Design an enzyme around this catalytic site. Structure first.
Site, PDB file in Angstrom:
ATOM      1  N   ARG A   1      19.197   1.146  -6.143  1.00  0.00           N
ATOM      2  CA  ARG A   1      19.303  -0.078  -6.848  1.00  0.00           C
ATOM      3  C   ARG A   1      20.581  -0.277  -6.609  1.00  0.00           C
ATOM      4  O   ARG A   1      21.809   0.422  -6.480  1.00  0.00           O
ATOM      5  CB  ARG A   1      18.953   0.337  -8.288  1.00  0.00           C
ATOM      6  N   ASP A  30       2.572  -4.000  -6.055  1.00  0.00           N
ATOM      7  CA  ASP A  30       2.175  -4.630  -7.285  1.00  0.00           C
ATOM      8  C   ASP A  30       1.404  -6.167  -7.030  1.00  0.00           C
ATOM      9  O   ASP A  30       0.862  -6.717  -7.917  1.00  0.00           O
ATOM     10  CB  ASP A  30       3.252  -5.234  -8.061  1.00  0.00           C
ATOM     11  CG  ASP A  30       4.324  -4.526  -8.425  1.00  0.00           C
ATOM     12  OD1 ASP A  30       4.073  -3.319  -8.919  1.00  0.00           O
ATOM     13  OD2 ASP A  30       5.490  -4.800  -8.651  1.00  0.00           O
ATOM     14  N   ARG A  51       3.456  -3.268 -14.568  1.00  0.00           N
ATOM     15  CA  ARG A  51       4.291  -3.741 -15.865  1.00  0.00           C
ATOM     16  C   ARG A  51       4.006  -5.026 -16.082  1.00  0.00           C
ATOM     17  O   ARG A  51       3.950  -5.513 -17.102  1.00  0.00           O
ATOM     18  CB  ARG A  51       5.515  -3.149 -15.661  1.00  0.00           C
ATOM     19  CG  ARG A  51       6.471  -3.640 -16.846  1.00  0.00           C
ATOM     20  CD  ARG A  51       7.893  -2.772 -16.626  1.00  0.00           C
ATOM     21  NE  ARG A  51       7.701  -1.417 -16.226  1.00  0.00           N
ATOM     22  CZ  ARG A  51       8.592  -0.552 -15.685  1.00  0.00           C
ATOM     23  NH1 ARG A  51       9.624  -1.352 -15.657  1.00  0.00           N
ATOM     24  NH2 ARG A  51       8.463   0.478 -15.535  1.00  0.00           N
TER      25      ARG A  51
END
Lengths: 319, 319, 319, 319
Positions: free
Chosen positions: A72, A127, A171
């Protein structure tokens, strides 16, 4: 273009190594040198850049994860961050970058092309919520990991243990829950996009129990709520013993299926063709069974949507 | 013996259809008739008994589950409940019974041998805590389901997600966690038969993080506690992002591995052998790589223990 | 309508049970009775028709094969066979028919459509060579079955055994070989639609060995020739130990993957929709990621093609 | 002992990396340095030796193959090969050697110990014919690879394609065929250790066809003959369409099962203890579920045997 780089950012996913292999092999095929950048944008700032040779992507095609690692890097949002990254690109003589990853990896690709460094985005995520592509690299492998769990629950033959709650990833996007539920024969599919009624969920469950459904499988996306508390709510409300499975990060790993490796090979090689013919600031995809490429800013303004015909079909088949 | 019966009881486990098939075929090879008893002891009381032919156990060998179903029967733990079971066995003229299941079905086998009914017990559970056998039918398949999840978690290539908590089954025995942990490279294995210090769990975690260990995988057996609560506590104490997988009833399903099918085949065939030579009151097993058979009552007096050397070995190889 | 029928014909393929499930559940949802036809067109002529209830397709979504069986009926090519076929539909009250299968099954659907019997054809085959659809039900499963074997051959870590020939199915179409080989990193793909130089196969092999390629995996479509025979000629010509795998009928079976269950479910529901809206003589399909339906005789006029860019890209990434 | 070496030789097999990992971690836990010998005995003679740290065996436990590679070495059957081997060992300061592999690698471990070079042999092979151990590392994984192919063949639901011939590995030993056949429900198993009659194969084939047997699966060990030739004769004599699968080198690769990782971990750490405790010239194994260790030359004069009760049992369950 004489020297390009490649890097993976965001959650890793099955098929990132087949995208790295096709980037490296297609660029070396047309005489271009490929430098691997380790640890995403964090290692771009730090200078963790190392030439990749033909043989370094040997035996990675069938492997999950990413051999370049991911990290990240919120410092790359800022202008300081981007100038430290560009200085490392300039220092090794890298003229273009292929960036494999999600939405946030595309924000860095857009910012780099505005500072004079042609970059292309390859959709790497499980996702399925990267705009401008029907399928993201990793989505098909994640569906095969959820349906392995669902098929194993289908073997139980215990009379008083018929009610199963599986919590999948998702999510913000309900793509993993919806395609898994349809493929698994889930009775109730709880995705972020649709609103559900708990009274409807209980009713259907009772209706299936009365006609002798052997198993009643409920899929909850992690974005709607926890399987554990759904499982306590269903057992309390009906008196049926309810078992919960929480897959967690198993959905991210695994050897990539045949569709993700074909897709990562097509998309990684197309991004090298875009950098070699002057186009920078773009992101590749597969839309309507065709290799397409979109400007990053235009692609990121579209919203992710799920097929509502597929969601309605999942309730009609499950009676 | 002219006619025998066969039943499954307790948690279903992979290999039960292979055990039913060798019972059927071994009995039919020697000219005996075989009656399937549906829904365990509950259907024995009910009279849910039905002739099984050679072709009825065809294409079940490779399937999870039990084709005869399993159920709970609280009435069979009373004298009146055991007397109605015998009544139905005498009404169909079933002279002997092969019971496949856990500890609880062994207790019913015992009780029916006391009333004049020859019974043989076959070890079908994924826990591995059935006395008188090294291995139970279903243990090997449940280990392969757990290491499939661990292997997928090892492909993540994300720097900040390094601590993984997996919760396996095994209320009183730690065999699934101990063998899964050794097979999957777990750093810390929490089983009911050993004592753990939470402080040493944290301390191993920080040691490995300091050396550059790519993943820290903790297996927790369900009789110690919940993976969710352990993950919460690990996260809070260290500050490391902690990801939790709870497999639940996935570990009971699936197609049996090669070892479970061979083991069920041999064990079910041996059960019919003992009944046709007049033994009754016995349970088969594999002890020291040899087919063995024990009095149920003497078999049920022993205590299940795990391998301390194997538990010692999992801490030395996870440095 | 009030009563519809469903049949499977041709070689069976994984996903055919998912297609049947969605045919029965979709018609029952709209108030239509569904009758199953056993043994393809042989049992339609024979009279082998039995009503299917909601729970009759329960627990079949995840299994390979077809529960309605499949058969060869030479008789159905004659006018007399067609007329006995329509006798039994009309005696049982069936007003329309869903047909799941290949090329051969579509011809029968044409013929019954032409005698006033509304029929819709659904693409079930592992090959991928059914016109009017990009993907056939069963194709995705067969790709994952071939890449499971290629992945295992990539683990051999012996330096004197580096050349493997794998022979996959596909009499006329090279989809299985082309997609398998791009996904498994094969160096040489021999498909029926492209021409090869044997001496160019030898030169690449030699080249790869000079740079230190670990493996040399050659995929051979069965249409082209025997893998055995091709492996013998590579050994003779180069002197490299060559090992051959012949998968055979392994490629037709197995549990259908997530894409095959979604595709079967959507296509089977589309077929019932067309019968209920009055369309008859149609075949469903997925073209440019969209559900389409084509006239069967128009559909059967096209020729199957393979993507030439995917064949060229396979040669570019295997350097 | 201050420094030890590890090497893998012979055909590779699943679980070799788990044995390499437990050799390196176990030696480092007791403060010993571990050097890896690349390319078996061929790289031993060349001085292709490099130190392995704790983290260099990280993430290999679940992978097939060997990271140290194996290579045929004809020079090590001669005394000068052997004396060059010892020269390189003394030059790097290696005091003992763990040899992971088959019979041929045991031969070199015996000659090394006869020139005072402490060597311990670990049984790595899929065949199961290394004397002194009940189970070789790799045999459980290869059994599961053969039953995945047999399971897929049981899904085909065609009435004219019922007779299937699978050719498995095992040149001298019938272990893979006997355990796969029994686990797969093969009707006829042809292994080197039992005499078959081709009239008895045809008669039992027709018996099952007459009764309604869905499939007729025959397993042929490669040491008895070809699967293709056997297929020709079965179809010639009976007229039944007969399909052949030749698995070949797919049986040597793949991620090791739970039993192979546990077995490799215990056996490889026990090899390290033997060197440390001054017993060289020995080979480890698992006999009657217990870690045992035998002198290499005593072990090597024992013959390989199969359980004949299990062979007879396979014909009794297949009716």
């Amino acid at each position: 273009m004489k020297r390009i780089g490649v890097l993976t950012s965001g959650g890793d996913s099955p098929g990132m190594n087949a995208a790295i292999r096709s980037v490296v092999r297609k660029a070396i095929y047309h005489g271009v040198e490929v430098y691997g950048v380790y640890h995403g944008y964090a290692g771009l700032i730090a200078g963790n850049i190392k030439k990749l040779e033909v043989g370094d992507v040997g035996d990675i095609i069938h492997r999950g994860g990413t051999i370049l690692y991911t990290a990240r890097c919120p410092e790359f949002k800022t202008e300081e961050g981007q100038k430290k990254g560009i200085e490392q690109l300039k220092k090794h003589g890298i003229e273009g970058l292929v960036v494999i990853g999600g939405d946030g990896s595309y924000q860095g690709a857009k910012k780099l092309t505005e500072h004079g460094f042609p970059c292309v985005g390859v959709p790497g995520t499980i996702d399925n919520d990267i705009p401008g592509t029907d399928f993201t690299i990793g989505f098909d492998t994640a569906l095969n990991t959820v349906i392995d769990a669902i098929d194993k629950i289908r073997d139980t033959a215990t009379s008083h243990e018929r009610t199963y709650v599986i919590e999948v990833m998702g999510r913000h996007a309900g793509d993993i829950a919806l395609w898994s539920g349809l493929a698994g024969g889930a009775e109730t599919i709880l995705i972020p996009e649709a609103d559900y009624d708990m009274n409807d969920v209980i009713a259907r469950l009772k209706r299936g129990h009365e006609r002798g459904k052997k198993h009643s499988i409920i899929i909850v996306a992690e974005g709607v709520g926890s399987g554990v508390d759904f499982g306590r709510q269903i057992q309390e409300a009906t008196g049926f013993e309810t078992r919960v499975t929480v897959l967690g990060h198993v959905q991210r790993g695994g050897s990539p299926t045949a569709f993700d490796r074909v897709l990562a090979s097509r998309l990684g090689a197309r991004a090298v063709e875009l950098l070699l013919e002057g186009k920078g600031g773009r992101c590749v995809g597969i839309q309507n069974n065709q290799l397409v490429d979109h400007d990053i800013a235009e692609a990121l303004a579209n919203k992710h949507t799920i097929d509502q015909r597929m969601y309605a079909l999942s309730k009609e088949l499950s009676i």
